[PDB]
mmCIF file of all heavy atoms in Angstrom:
data_model
loop_
_atom_site.group_PDB
_atom_site.id
_atom_site.type_symbol
_atom_site.label_atom_id
_atom_site.label_comp_id
_atom_site.label_asym_id
_atom_site.label_seq_id
_atom_site.Cartn_x
_atom_site.Cartn_y
_atom_site.Cartn_z
ATOM 1 N N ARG A 240 104.210 111.571 53.970
ATOM 2 C CA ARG A 240 104.051 110.255 54.579
ATOM 3 C C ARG A 240 105.319 109.412 54.547
ATOM 4 O O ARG A 240 105.297 108.290 55.064
ATOM 5 C CB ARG A 240 102.914 109.478 53.900
ATOM 6 C CG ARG A 240 101.561 110.156 53.989
ATOM 7 C CD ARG A 240 101.171 110.386 55.434
ATOM 8 N NE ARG A 240 100.982 109.131 56.148
ATOM 9 C CZ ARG A 240 100.888 109.025 57.467
ATOM 10 N NH1 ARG A 240 101.039 110.076 58.259
ATOM 11 N NH2 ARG A 240 100.636 107.836 58.005
ATOM 12 N N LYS A 241 106.415 109.911 53.962
ATOM 13 C CA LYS A 241 107.632 109.107 53.864
ATOM 14 C C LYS A 241 108.115 108.653 55.237
ATOM 15 O O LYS A 241 108.478 107.480 55.423
ATOM 16 C CB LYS A 241 108.734 109.888 53.139
ATOM 17 C CG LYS A 241 110.139 109.309 53.366
ATOM 18 C CD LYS A 241 111.228 110.008 52.528
ATOM 19 C CE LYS A 241 111.682 109.128 51.374
ATOM 20 N NZ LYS A 241 112.738 109.746 50.500
ATOM 21 N N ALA A 242 108.112 109.565 56.215
ATOM 22 C CA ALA A 242 108.567 109.213 57.559
ATOM 23 C C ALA A 242 107.739 108.074 58.138
ATOM 24 O O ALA A 242 108.279 107.161 58.778
ATOM 25 C CB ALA A 242 108.504 110.439 58.473
ATOM 26 N N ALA A 243 106.422 108.124 57.940
ATOM 27 C CA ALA A 243 105.552 107.080 58.466
ATOM 28 C C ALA A 243 105.853 105.746 57.797
ATOM 29 O O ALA A 243 105.854 104.695 58.449
ATOM 30 C CB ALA A 243 104.085 107.470 58.258
ATOM 31 N N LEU A 244 106.118 105.771 56.493
ATOM 32 C CA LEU A 244 106.462 104.536 55.800
ATOM 33 C C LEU A 244 107.782 103.978 56.311
ATOM 34 O O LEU A 244 107.898 102.771 56.555
ATOM 35 C CB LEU A 244 106.499 104.782 54.290
ATOM 36 C CG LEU A 244 105.106 104.878 53.667
ATOM 37 C CD1 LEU A 244 105.110 105.530 52.289
ATOM 38 C CD2 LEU A 244 104.505 103.486 53.571
ATOM 39 N N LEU A 245 108.778 104.846 56.531
ATOM 40 C CA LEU A 245 110.075 104.353 56.994
ATOM 41 C C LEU A 245 109.974 103.739 58.380
ATOM 42 O O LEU A 245 110.664 102.756 58.676
ATOM 43 C CB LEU A 245 111.118 105.479 56.983
ATOM 44 C CG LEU A 245 111.612 105.954 55.610
ATOM 45 C CD1 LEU A 245 112.544 107.166 55.753
ATOM 46 C CD2 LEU A 245 112.312 104.824 54.838
ATOM 47 N N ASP A 246 109.132 104.301 59.254
ATOM 48 C CA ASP A 246 108.984 103.704 60.584
ATOM 49 C C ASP A 246 108.312 102.334 60.502
ATOM 50 O O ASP A 246 108.652 101.421 61.262
ATOM 51 C CB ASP A 246 108.186 104.621 61.512
ATOM 52 C CG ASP A 246 108.292 104.194 62.981
ATOM 53 O OD1 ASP A 246 109.416 104.242 63.524
ATOM 54 O OD2 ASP A 246 107.269 103.795 63.593
ATOM 55 N N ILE A 247 107.341 102.178 59.601
ATOM 56 C CA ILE A 247 106.763 100.856 59.360
ATOM 57 C C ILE A 247 107.851 99.885 58.912
ATOM 58 O O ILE A 247 107.965 98.764 59.425
ATOM 59 C CB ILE A 247 105.620 100.952 58.331
ATOM 60 C CG1 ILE A 247 104.385 101.592 58.963
ATOM 61 C CG2 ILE A 247 105.281 99.588 57.741
ATOM 62 C CD1 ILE A 247 103.324 101.997 57.960
ATOM 63 N N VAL A 248 108.683 100.308 57.956
ATOM 64 C CA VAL A 248 109.763 99.434 57.507
ATOM 65 C C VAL A 248 110.711 99.117 58.659
ATOM 66 O O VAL A 248 111.131 97.965 58.838
ATOM 67 C CB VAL A 248 110.495 100.067 56.314
ATOM 68 C CG1 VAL A 248 111.803 99.329 56.045
ATOM 69 C CG2 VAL A 248 109.598 100.028 55.095
ATOM 70 N N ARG A 249 111.042 100.127 59.473
ATOM 71 C CA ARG A 249 111.912 99.895 60.623
ATOM 72 C C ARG A 249 111.306 98.872 61.578
ATOM 73 O O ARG A 249 112.006 97.989 62.088
ATOM 74 C CB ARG A 249 112.184 101.216 61.358
ATOM 75 C CG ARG A 249 112.813 101.024 62.742
ATOM 76 C CD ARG A 249 112.773 102.294 63.623
ATOM 77 N NE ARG A 249 111.452 102.573 64.192
ATOM 78 C CZ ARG A 249 110.901 101.913 65.205
ATOM 79 N NH1 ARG A 249 111.526 100.912 65.806
ATOM 80 N NH2 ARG A 249 109.678 102.247 65.609
ATOM 81 N N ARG A 250 110.003 98.966 61.824
ATOM 82 C CA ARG A 250 109.368 97.989 62.700
ATOM 83 C C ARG A 250 109.330 96.603 62.059
ATOM 84 O O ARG A 250 109.504 95.595 62.748
ATOM 85 C CB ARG A 250 107.965 98.462 63.074
ATOM 86 C CG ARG A 250 107.972 99.610 64.076
ATOM 87 C CD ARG A 250 106.631 100.295 64.080
ATOM 88 N NE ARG A 250 105.570 99.332 64.344
ATOM 89 C CZ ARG A 250 104.368 99.376 63.786
ATOM 90 N NH1 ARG A 250 104.020 100.362 62.974
ATOM 91 N NH2 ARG A 250 103.501 98.391 64.031
ATOM 92 N N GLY A 251 109.124 96.528 60.741
ATOM 93 C CA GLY A 251 109.203 95.230 60.078
ATOM 94 C C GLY A 251 110.549 94.554 60.270
ATOM 95 O O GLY A 251 110.619 93.354 60.561
ATOM 96 N N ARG A 252 111.637 95.322 60.141
ATOM 97 C CA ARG A 252 112.969 94.774 60.393
ATOM 98 C C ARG A 252 113.095 94.265 61.822
ATOM 99 O O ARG A 252 113.642 93.183 62.059
ATOM 100 C CB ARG A 252 114.043 95.834 60.118
ATOM 101 C CG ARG A 252 115.470 95.349 60.396
ATOM 102 C CD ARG A 252 115.729 94.093 59.575
ATOM 103 N NE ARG A 252 116.983 93.425 59.908
ATOM 104 C CZ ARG A 252 118.076 93.467 59.155
ATOM 105 N NH1 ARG A 252 118.129 94.200 58.055
ATOM 106 N NH2 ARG A 252 119.139 92.751 59.512
ATOM 107 N N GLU A 253 112.598 95.033 62.791
ATOM 108 C CA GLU A 253 112.702 94.597 64.177
ATOM 109 C C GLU A 253 111.905 93.323 64.409
ATOM 110 O O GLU A 253 112.354 92.427 65.128
ATOM 111 C CB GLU A 253 112.232 95.699 65.124
ATOM 112 C CG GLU A 253 113.211 96.847 65.245
ATOM 113 C CD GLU A 253 112.626 98.034 65.998
ATOM 114 O OE1 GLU A 253 111.552 97.881 66.617
ATOM 115 O OE2 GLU A 253 113.239 99.123 65.956
ATOM 116 N N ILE A 254 110.729 93.214 63.796
ATOM 117 C CA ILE A 254 109.957 91.980 63.933
ATOM 118 C C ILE A 254 110.729 90.811 63.335
ATOM 119 O O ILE A 254 110.892 89.761 63.969
ATOM 120 C CB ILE A 254 108.567 92.144 63.293
ATOM 121 C CG1 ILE A 254 107.730 93.104 64.158
ATOM 122 C CG2 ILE A 254 107.878 90.779 63.139
ATOM 123 C CD1 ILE A 254 106.547 93.736 63.459
ATOM 124 N N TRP A 255 111.250 90.988 62.115
ATOM 125 C CA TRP A 255 112.045 89.924 61.497
ATOM 126 C C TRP A 255 113.245 89.548 62.361
ATOM 127 O O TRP A 255 113.606 88.369 62.446
ATOM 128 C CB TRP A 255 112.504 90.339 60.096
ATOM 129 C CG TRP A 255 111.551 89.929 59.004
ATOM 130 C CD1 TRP A 255 110.853 90.754 58.177
ATOM 131 C CD2 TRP A 255 111.194 88.590 58.631
ATOM 132 N NE1 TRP A 255 110.078 90.017 57.307
ATOM 133 C CE2 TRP A 255 110.272 88.685 57.566
ATOM 134 C CE3 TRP A 255 111.558 87.318 59.099
ATOM 135 C CZ2 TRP A 255 109.709 87.552 56.958
ATOM 136 C CZ3 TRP A 255 111.000 86.196 58.490
ATOM 137 C CH2 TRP A 255 110.085 86.323 57.436
ATOM 138 N N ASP A 256 113.863 90.534 63.036
ATOM 139 C CA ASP A 256 115.026 90.216 63.865
ATOM 140 C C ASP A 256 114.681 89.336 65.057
ATOM 141 O O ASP A 256 115.572 88.674 65.592
ATOM 142 C CB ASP A 256 115.713 91.489 64.354
ATOM 143 C CG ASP A 256 116.484 92.183 63.257
ATOM 144 O OD1 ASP A 256 116.699 91.576 62.191
ATOM 145 O OD2 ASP A 256 116.835 93.350 63.446
ATOM 146 N N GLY A 257 113.425 89.305 65.484
ATOM 147 C CA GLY A 257 113.062 88.411 66.567
ATOM 148 C C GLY A 257 112.573 87.056 66.116
ATOM 149 O O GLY A 257 112.214 86.208 66.943
ATOM 150 N N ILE A 258 112.557 86.819 64.815
ATOM 151 C CA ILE A 258 111.956 85.624 64.228
ATOM 152 C C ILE A 258 113.063 84.624 63.898
ATOM 153 O O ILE A 258 114.034 84.999 63.223
ATOM 154 C CB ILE A 258 111.148 85.989 62.971
ATOM 155 C CG1 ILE A 258 109.793 86.572 63.369
ATOM 156 C CG2 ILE A 258 110.982 84.781 62.054
ATOM 157 C CD1 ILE A 258 109.014 87.094 62.192
ATOM 158 N N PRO A 259 112.961 83.366 64.338
ATOM 159 C CA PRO A 259 114.032 82.390 64.054
ATOM 160 C C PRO A 259 113.914 81.786 62.655
ATOM 161 O O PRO A 259 113.738 80.575 62.477
ATOM 162 C CB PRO A 259 113.822 81.355 65.161
ATOM 163 C CG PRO A 259 112.319 81.340 65.336
ATOM 164 C CD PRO A 259 111.840 82.753 65.076
ATOM 165 N N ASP A 260 114.016 82.648 61.641
ATOM 166 C CA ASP A 260 113.786 82.214 60.263
ATOM 167 C C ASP A 260 114.864 81.245 59.795
ATOM 168 O O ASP A 260 114.567 80.245 59.129
ATOM 169 C CB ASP A 260 113.731 83.429 59.335
ATOM 170 C CG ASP A 260 113.466 83.046 57.893
ATOM 171 O OD1 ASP A 260 112.303 82.700 57.584
ATOM 172 O OD2 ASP A 260 114.420 83.079 57.075
ATOM 173 N N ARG A 261 116.118 81.524 60.149
ATOM 174 C CA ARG A 261 117.228 80.687 59.719
ATOM 175 C C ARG A 261 117.054 79.254 60.199
ATOM 176 O O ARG A 261 117.315 78.303 59.451
ATOM 177 C CB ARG A 261 118.539 81.273 60.236
ATOM 178 C CG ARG A 261 119.774 80.747 59.520
ATOM 179 C CD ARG A 261 120.996 81.582 59.866
ATOM 180 N NE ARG A 261 122.198 81.081 59.211
ATOM 181 C CZ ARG A 261 122.910 80.058 59.661
ATOM 182 N NH1 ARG A 261 122.563 79.411 60.762
ATOM 183 N NH2 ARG A 261 123.991 79.668 58.987
ATOM 184 N N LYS A 262 116.605 79.082 61.442
ATOM 185 C CA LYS A 262 116.404 77.743 61.975
ATOM 186 C C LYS A 262 115.462 76.934 61.089
ATOM 187 O O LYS A 262 115.725 75.764 60.799
ATOM 188 C CB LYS A 262 115.861 77.824 63.400
ATOM 189 C CG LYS A 262 115.605 76.471 64.037
ATOM 190 C CD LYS A 262 114.937 76.634 65.385
ATOM 191 C CE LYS A 262 113.477 77.066 65.205
ATOM 192 N NZ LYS A 262 112.838 77.335 66.513
ATOM 193 N N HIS A 263 114.362 77.542 60.643
ATOM 194 C CA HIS A 263 113.396 76.797 59.844
ATOM 195 C C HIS A 263 113.909 76.549 58.433
ATOM 196 O O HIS A 263 113.780 75.437 57.913
ATOM 197 C CB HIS A 263 112.053 77.534 59.832
ATOM 198 C CG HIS A 263 111.380 77.527 61.168
ATOM 199 N ND1 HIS A 263 110.665 76.445 61.633
ATOM 200 C CD2 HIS A 263 111.379 78.441 62.168
ATOM 201 C CE1 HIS A 263 110.220 76.708 62.851
ATOM 202 N NE2 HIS A 263 110.642 77.913 63.199
ATOM 203 N N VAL A 264 114.508 77.562 57.807
ATOM 204 C CA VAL A 264 115.034 77.391 56.459
ATOM 205 C C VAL A 264 116.079 76.273 56.425
ATOM 206 O O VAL A 264 116.052 75.402 55.544
ATOM 207 C CB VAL A 264 115.610 78.719 55.938
ATOM 208 C CG1 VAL A 264 116.306 78.483 54.607
ATOM 209 C CG2 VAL A 264 114.497 79.754 55.796
ATOM 210 N N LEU A 265 117.010 76.276 57.386
ATOM 211 C CA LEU A 265 118.075 75.273 57.382
ATOM 212 C C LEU A 265 117.539 73.881 57.669
ATOM 213 O O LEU A 265 118.125 72.884 57.232
ATOM 214 C CB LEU A 265 119.161 75.628 58.402
ATOM 215 C CG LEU A 265 120.030 76.828 58.032
ATOM 216 C CD1 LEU A 265 121.139 77.012 59.046
ATOM 217 C CD2 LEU A 265 120.596 76.657 56.626
ATOM 218 N N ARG A 266 116.440 73.793 58.413
ATOM 219 C CA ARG A 266 115.819 72.502 58.665
ATOM 220 C C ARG A 266 115.431 71.814 57.363
ATOM 221 O O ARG A 266 115.734 70.633 57.155
ATOM 222 C CB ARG A 266 114.600 72.692 59.550
ATOM 223 C CG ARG A 266 114.470 71.648 60.590
ATOM 224 C CD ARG A 266 113.345 72.017 61.526
ATOM 225 N NE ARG A 266 113.823 72.509 62.810
ATOM 226 C CZ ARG A 266 113.016 72.954 63.761
ATOM 227 N NH1 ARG A 266 111.711 73.044 63.564
ATOM 228 N NH2 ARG A 266 113.529 73.305 64.939
#
Side-chain angles (χ1 to χ4, degrees):
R240 300 302 295 167
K241 162 174 254 179
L244 284 162
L245 288 175
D246 194 64
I247 286 168
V248 167
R249 167 194 76 75
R250 286 163 55 216
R252 178 56 189 255
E253 287 170 12
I254 290 160
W255 269 116
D256 286 347
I258 281 174
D260 181 75
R261 198 168 179 279
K262 179 186 73 185
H263 292 280
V264 173
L265 289 185
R266 221 173 255 176

